[model samples]
Target chain A: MNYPVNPDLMPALMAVFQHVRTRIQSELDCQRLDLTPPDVHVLKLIDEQRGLNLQDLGRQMCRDKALITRKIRELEGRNLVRRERNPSDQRSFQLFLTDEGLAIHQHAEAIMSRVHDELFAPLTPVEQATLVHLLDQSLAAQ
Target chain B: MNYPVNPDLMPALMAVFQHVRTRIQSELDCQRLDLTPPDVHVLKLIDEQRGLNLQDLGRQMCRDKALITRKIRELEGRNLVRRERNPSDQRSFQLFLTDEGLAIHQHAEAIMSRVHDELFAPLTPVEQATLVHLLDQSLAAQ
Candidate 1:
């Protein structure tokens, strides 16, 4: 987290992200979920919204449609996700988690909670909320 | 930056980081630097601190010594860095940027600055400073 960026904010921020990400990734590996934080990210949306298609996922995530489409294809290949023809739109399909994917997501969520709890343990709850509030506002504005 | 995590702060922060990083990284690529944001990170420290040893760089960066050592070795091979045995300690060497490395660091700094300015353009100066201040404090504590 000590890597300095000129203007010093962005890369230093990334170092902290890297720290958090590496820890979460290691724990996920240990738990044998074979899921990445980014992958879990996709699972989360599909699990929540229930009827999102690739276009919606890509739009919401601000990623390229082709890129997300490829990712969704992999998730499908892994049997973690499936696509059903949208009755209203014959051209595309809605995305949903397979039962196994939901189970894995539940497990991954638990793993994420444990890691988040441990990492934020050093700071007070007030400290945590303020930081979150600031970041949330920053992102929302973008 | 939209990737959501429970408690939201860390991944939300990382989404911002990733937003910043993907831009910087792509620009670095377009320039044919063949250097990642991370490599520039190491170059920044060795250039600034001048007499830092591999172990010290690892300590300062909070990375594994062996991992940093291998990175240093690659930098050395690329003729961007050099290591001279420390007279004070034969077991280790001091790191320095080769002339080309220094040149590259300067160029990389420019690339970083331009990207940062563009990305932060949506916010007022006050907004930028406040956000940076909060993140800096968070990192310093860690």
Candidate 2:
């Protein structure tokens, strides 16, 4: 079935996405985090799901194993994350955040909070809830 | 004032963004477009607002001139876009999509529409309107 396309929807969504992304990146730049936005995303996920193996982490992040390995290696080099040999599988390693990584994650979370507040400042509480709910529905449908 | 952070929001937004992006990228890959998502964005903008010079396009896109110039050059190399010296300014060139570019733009728009419909299929009309309206409000505040 053909559905009517909303010309404004794509542009609006793109605008909002770009605005939120750039704001977060700018805040990260100001803090000199030594991490790209994608890197922060990896760090944040690792911090939340500590002890996830590399394959699971890659699956959760919707990234390929190679890309996830590259990011993990880079973070490991910076002492932001560490890998432990998986007890069940010698071929795989479990990931966890180092103390330094936790500290940076806190800072990154703060930056994200501030940016989110500012981005949604124009909306009322009800509107914010509705927006979040709608986005959740859209994501689930995918 | 210290505001409580909603940890769920950032991840939710990221998930939605990644879902949309990967879907678009996958379609582009299937079509063998050989253009990155950012490149399609440039073509879409130029197709919508013809005659924008490099600086103006960059400003509108919130990208630096260097990045814009690189994308324009790449598209020119592919014969998808062309630049004409601006009559009002000898130093700047106005941007336009070639016939090839317009055809690709139409194809891209079709893909976008299909993806968008699937993404929003779970939402009611009211919910869709609310989503777009909230995103528009957020973007405007930026």
Candidate 3:
């Protein structure tokens, strides 16, 4: 099937998404979080799922084992997280947020919420809902 | 003003958006693109502009100067691009894609188009237009 190329759409959408990401990073930087975007994203996952295993965490982040391993090391070094041996699988470890990590996670959540609101304030309620719905449809296409 | 937190929106939207990014990276990997996401993005900018300085490229990519400097070094090492010292500013250099870079950029564009179609295939025409418009509104909000 021939799909029409919306050259303007892709570039504009990508630019906006990229800007939002960069702005989030800047906010995190201002707060001295010392975390990469992936790092913070993983932390959010771990916070929500207290004892998520490395493999599960990797799946949740849609990343390979190696990338997860590297970020885990960085998070561990920062004392933001700790891993305990998984009872079900001795070879795998379950991740948990450290107290410091939990605190940082909360801060990051607040930052994200604020930024998201400011970013989407221009959209009407219906537009916001539709925008998210379309994104859902797009992902569902995968 | 008070904005009600759209609870479902953030979690689902983030997951879907992230999935799109990861899927795109996977496509690049399948194609054996030597460039990282940022590298390809930078190349596209130079391809679009023909001769952009390092600082301008950094600004366009929303990346740090040091990082863009390193990326340019890597691209130069691969002979994909050449840096010419800007006569007006001795410290700044103009980036130009070599013939090889141009070829790769064209290939990357094709890959991106395929990826975009795959991601957006489920959207109706109106849905796609609304998504683009809402995304633009988010960035232009303030």
Candidate 4:
């Protein structure tokens, strides 16, 4: 059996990937979005799913229930999201975007589009598509 | 002309990828490892190249010089790395891993191997290979 080469390489590779991501995030923060990455993630999920409970959101984001609760509370304080009791489940609340939240979401979407250009500026469209496909399949397999 | 779809998706995707990664990291922290992700990164660079200066190390990690300095200092305090003044560059110090550092590197590599297995459990070998290739190309592109 051929064992994988460079067994020690994954950790360094992950660190490099993380460093580039943080670089992009710092640039995003400069736009005065006033949103943490997790906050932005919550907004994106609401934008995609329309409405989702805190638990379901936690599962999708791979966060603890308590951490998600705290993040939601922070978003609620900022008026980006409003919580309403789930009619079907008294134990949970569904999250929805406020008008302000919607506006921020749209603005953020535009800014992030620019960020994507800068991030993939080094690669051709073909490379970007290939990378996206590979990433999707990799994550999907998980 | 057809413009590409909104680019906000890249940040959101990146955010989710990071979110999952951190979640996994929290799990790894429970194992009582002496090195954090950043420390492991520095150690690996030193191990791979044998000699690197503060400036190059910071640039390689895409982090601030001050931050890398602090990390290097901490590792030196633990006797994991030695800092020697560069013979040619008076302003910088060369970094090298100590014997203990190499031993810890072995332990940390084992830990990372196990973690990678768990994290990529859902991915097949083919998918993992594809992700490694695509992501490496993306980073190396620029």
Candidate 5:
């Protein structure tokens, strides 16, 4: 954006995010993945937290519950995700990936792992830690 | 998303970006701005680089040219942008912000500046410089 004076924050962060997004999308294209960057994001998080419910997933994603619900519905329609009613809470349902979803999640994970290397290759391990720590602190405060 | 093994990289970046995005969007909503975050982004870059052509704008944003062209058309439709033929090249056109676009741009700039402060407030200015420097290096290599 037009961060002429404060290029240290928004402009740099925007550019870096854009760069990594494009790079990751290109990798996804190679595998002919049906998922987009955002789709993979949702799928990845859902894959990570096996018992995560819709409300929790939305909270973790910093997304609106409605939007998250829609995405989960889409994922369910694609047979990538399935819902199981919580045994202790009849009104609550937990999300889990289908067999097909697991395969996609694995591929997505591998792709992210490789891209993650190139993304952080420019910094030392300590520098990477500091960067993440700073980012984490900011995110938490927000 | 599922950056369990490397939470320092993708997960941190993802969360930070999402946090900032939500913060900015809320500010935009307060102003009753007709623009989304990505719209503000394109408007900002175009405002900063007067006379920038479509190809260059796409390159700068790391977006596909077709997508950039579509956004320009939409902006043009809203009377926010106009194109003038490049005198040196009859087939090329230079982009400029309309008076209305300028007003919106200024507002958008103010919003970004305020949000940018909170985003980096956790870090000292020197630390901000380091974070941006490290980000710039990674972006350049990619």
Candidate 6:
């Protein structure tokens, strides 16, 4: 079956993605977070979900289990995350953000808020909402 | 100044970005292009602009000059791109896609088109246009 192609969509999406990713990195640098986008993302997810195991985190992040394990270990080394043995699963452990992790997550959240506001400033509230809805639909398509 | 943060936006955007990126990689793999997303991206940009220098390509793609140089070198190694010394600017070289580079780029474009259609399948034509316009505005924010 043939699918309708939009030649312009991919480039525009890529441009926007790259712009946002770079801004996030710059924000991290300015704040002395010593964290990359993936780091911040993992931290944010851990903050939101207090006790996710490596497998669960990997599934939610849509990343490989090994990658998630590596990221979690890196975060653990930095004292931003901790892994405690999962009582029900002898072979697995649940992850949580430490105090430093929470502090960093909040700071990163503030930076993201500022960035999003600036990025969406050209659009009105209605437009922003529409964009979000449209993005949701696109994501759902996956 | 305090800005209202929409915590949902970043993760949603990340999810969509990852989904699209993975789809692009899968398409390349299926077509046996032996190229990654960055490779496809650089090739496409070179095909679009016949004689862009390293600095110009970096600026357009919002990447660092060093990274762009590395990608160009990789493509050159694969014989998909060629660099010619700029006669007017003795210190710099202009980039061009070879015939094989053009063929690979067209194939990558076709893959991208299919991926974009699948990703944006849930949106109507008007919604897709709106999303693209909104994304352009966000990119301009950079």
How accurately is candidate 5 docked according to DockQ? 0.26
- Which ten residues in a row are the worst by lDDT in model 2 chain A? A56-65
For model 5, residues B15-132, the per-residue Cα lDDT tens digits are 7766666566667765677576778878877888888876777463333467678999999999888999889888888899999999998998888777877777766666777788
Worst 10 residues of 3 chain B by lDDT: B58-67
DockQ for all candidate structures vs. native: 0.16, 0.31, 0.37, 0.17, 0.26, 0.31
The CA lDDT at B73 in model 5 is 98
In order, the candidates keep a fraction of the true contacts of: 0.17, 0.37, 0.33, 0.12, 0.33, 0.39
Alpha-carbon lDDT, every model: 0.69, 0.74, 0.71, 0.63, 0.73, 0.73
Question: Cα lDDT for residue A130, model 2?
Answer: 72
lDDT tens string, model 1, B92-115?
Answer: 778889999999998998887776
Model 4 lDDT tens row, B13-35: 47535544565455445555645
Report clash pairs, candidate 4: none
What TM-score would each prediction reach against the true structure? 0.59, 0.74, 0.81, 0.59, 0.72, 0.70
Order by TM-score, highest first: 3, 2, 5, 6, 1, 4
Backbone clashes counted, model 6: 0
Task: Tell me which of candidates 1 and 2 scores higher on lDDT.
Answer: 2
Residue B110 lDDT in candidate 2: 84
For candidate 1, the per-residue lDDT at A14 reads: 54
Clashing pairs in 1: A5-A8
Q: Give model 5's docking category.
A: acceptable
Among all windows of ten consecutive residues in candidate 1 chain A, which has the lowest summed lDDT? A1-10
- Model 5: CA > 4 A from native: A1-7, A25-36, A50-70, A77-79, A83-93, A100-102, A105-113, B1-7, B60-65, B136-142
Residue pairs with colliding backbones in model 6 are none
The positional error of residue B95 in candidate 1, measured at the CA in angstroms, is 0.9
Off by over 4 Å in 2: A1-8, A25-36, A50-85, A95-112, B1-8, B60-64, B140-142
Candidate 2 residue-wise lDDT, B12-86, digit = tens? 777787677667766776677766567887898898787988677646223345756887898999999999999
